Symmetry: C2
Subunit: 115 residues, 2 copies
Amino acid sequence: SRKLISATDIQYSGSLLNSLNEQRGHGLFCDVTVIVEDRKFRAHKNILSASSTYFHQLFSVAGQVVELSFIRAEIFAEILNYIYSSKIVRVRSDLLDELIKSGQLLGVKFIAELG
Amino acid sequence: SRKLISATDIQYSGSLLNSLNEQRGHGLFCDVTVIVEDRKFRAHKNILSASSTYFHQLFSVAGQVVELSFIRAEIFAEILNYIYSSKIVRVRSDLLDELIKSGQLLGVKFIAELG
């Protein structure tokens, strides 16, 4: 009579990511600023550490502000869009090699392997 | 010749959640402790706020420690497992109404609607 119940919510992810992405737009709960060229990006260390082997290593020590070289701000903006959505959307073809290179550098496997 | 590229990573979610759940087990990046009965649960405010309408309201103000009444610790442990996985796994049938009630209270829709 002792039954065990299992259930999986296939809509949970998309909904969770969309809310995290909304928080990010407000800077809500953001505990790191990433400076890339002349731009500052507020983000959450837990999400960055989980999705990028570079950030995983970096946030075992870091403070509240970190800086990235060799990646243009608009490329990193797109890497963050993927990190907060699972998708890249209508990226211009002439930015693709730069995007792939940035995912190689950050250890973001899906992006690293687009090419 | 100007092409736009889109791509969706269907494995991103499961991988992201598993890493977040691993961080949680270490207390890594956890910025809130939730006290439930005689237990303390370390968790991340961003994930809790995104997945629970109650935590969404609560963390617009709160400090670093919050407390929940009316939910047993082992029920909340299972709510957190769902929040950090999308799934409930082999929950005993005699705990199900308590689980559903806890998701109603926390505004965790999938759990609230299990019954």
